[PDB]
Amino acid sequence: PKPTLWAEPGSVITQGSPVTLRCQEYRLYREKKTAPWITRIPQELVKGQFPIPSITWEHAGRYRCYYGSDTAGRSESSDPLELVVTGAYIKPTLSAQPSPVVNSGGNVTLQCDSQVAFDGFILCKEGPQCLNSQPHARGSSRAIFSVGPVSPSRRWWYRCYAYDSNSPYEWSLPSDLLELLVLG
Amino acid sequence: GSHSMRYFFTSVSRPGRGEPRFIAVGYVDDTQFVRFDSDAASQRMEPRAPWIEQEGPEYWDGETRKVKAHSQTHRVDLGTLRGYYNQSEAGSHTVQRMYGCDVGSDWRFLRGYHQYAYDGKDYIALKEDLRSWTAADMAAQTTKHKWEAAHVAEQLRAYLEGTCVEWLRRYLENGKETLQRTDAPKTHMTHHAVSDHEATLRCWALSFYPAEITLTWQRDGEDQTQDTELVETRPAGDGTFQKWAAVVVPSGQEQRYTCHVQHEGLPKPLTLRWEP
Amino acid sequence: IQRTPKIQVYSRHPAENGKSNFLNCYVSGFHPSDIEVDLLKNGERIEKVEHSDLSFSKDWSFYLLYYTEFTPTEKDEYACRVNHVTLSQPKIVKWDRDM
Amino acid sequence: RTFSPTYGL
Fold this sequence. Notes:
The complex is a heterotetramer of chains A (184), B (276), C (99) and D (9).
Chain B: E1 3-12, E2 21-28, E3 31-37, E4 46-47, H1 57-84, E5 94-103, E6 109-118, E7 121-126, E8 133-135, H2 139-149, H3 152-174, H4 176-179, E9 186-193, E10 198-208, E11 214-219, E12 222-223, E13 229-230, E14 234-235, E15 241-250, E16 257-262, E17 270-273
Chain C: E1 6-11, E2 21-30, E3 36-41, E4 44-45, E5 50-51, E6 55-56, E7 62-70, E8 78-83, E9 91-94
Antiparallel strand pairs in C: 1-2, 2-7, 3-4, 3-8, 5-7, 6-7, 8-9
Chain D: no helix or strand
């Protein structure tokens, strides 16, 4: 009977913040590489709680949960939880080109610049729904996102993150908030 | 086989805290033999291999002279480059330089090179003819024209094909035991459970020299290129190197996998079978 | 353009509890060259750690080996702590005998 | 042996 794996408050957590993986005899593991922090948790919580006092790069990755042991046994593997740690690197800067002032119905081009060499970029709306992108050219450390059409009815507030594609769960501290000023 | 001598120079400005930190190191192949650090009390080019300690007081006086002269040159280059890119005085900046000579199997000159960087990016490179320059950007084309008119490449060529290879050969002979002989990789495999249906097979190569090596995982003879995690080859600290390659496999299928090791020190390429 | 360091923490020789060895922290691929690297023992800075002479790779990024003599045990937790301008705060990487 | 001549950028 296939269980469900979630995190609280969520699955994208800043360095040094608390997070608890929950699923509903449990067994939590991480894909591709073992996660020792799981083994140092008391059994009182195991049966379905896995708390992390302050997250770091060590915790980042793709986890699945299940129960039983092939002769009990084997509840189907849960859907993957992708536990992302942000704030590992210095922040990029986000800018609106040509301007953060946009006419209603218009589109605008967002530009995320990391002064640190990274090949992975993420744009998040508020303030979260996030889009992913390679750099705008070969080895540039700059991504370009197209956004809109915009409307004065709603907020259009963004931040961007940078990361290394060999470590896609470890992100740099978000940019400052960029607000679009939409003119009706 | 082939051999090389290379000298690496780094100069780092330190705003408000006196002169730039200058550091130079010399290598033959993957073995370091000299160094200079401007912050050391010594104030001299120092030996960093046993075979270079055969050189007398004149070597150490002259190399200390020359590397100090280069220190001074790159100190000025920092100021020059700061002007060329209209940068402020707040930040630290870095000039780097590399040059040296490759000899082929025969021990006769094969290649020469001579390049700079500024703040990480390429700046100017001597092209492979040893007679023209590749400017990376425009500002470097200034440097290109001056050095072309002053005949900088020529003399560079005379060192590259002269003193460079000739002293490489002397070092090769003087450090024979270290530089002409190899350490074969010591190899083994480890196994780590990820889950009840997946496991990591890791293939190790240790205590090898030189650094150049290829580690690959196969499944039933097929290369598993896309799924192999390779770490960067790393120094052990005793003149030898280390590397591993890993693959996640289904539990119960490990015997399908073989590790393959190519290295100069091995008479023939090595096949490691998880289950012989 | 700056570059954040890759960090590997490892032993010179295969780890054996009791057999003295060298604990290595190799930082590579970084830029600029200034970097703070400490080897830790149960979260405590080790004194008199040595390092190689600053050098660099094809792409001009730097590498350094930091190292100290050590004796692995069952109980003692070894780590390498790295700080650099590309990082928010110090990154701690624990010594894993497997990697 | 290092290269003897000077010549800045």
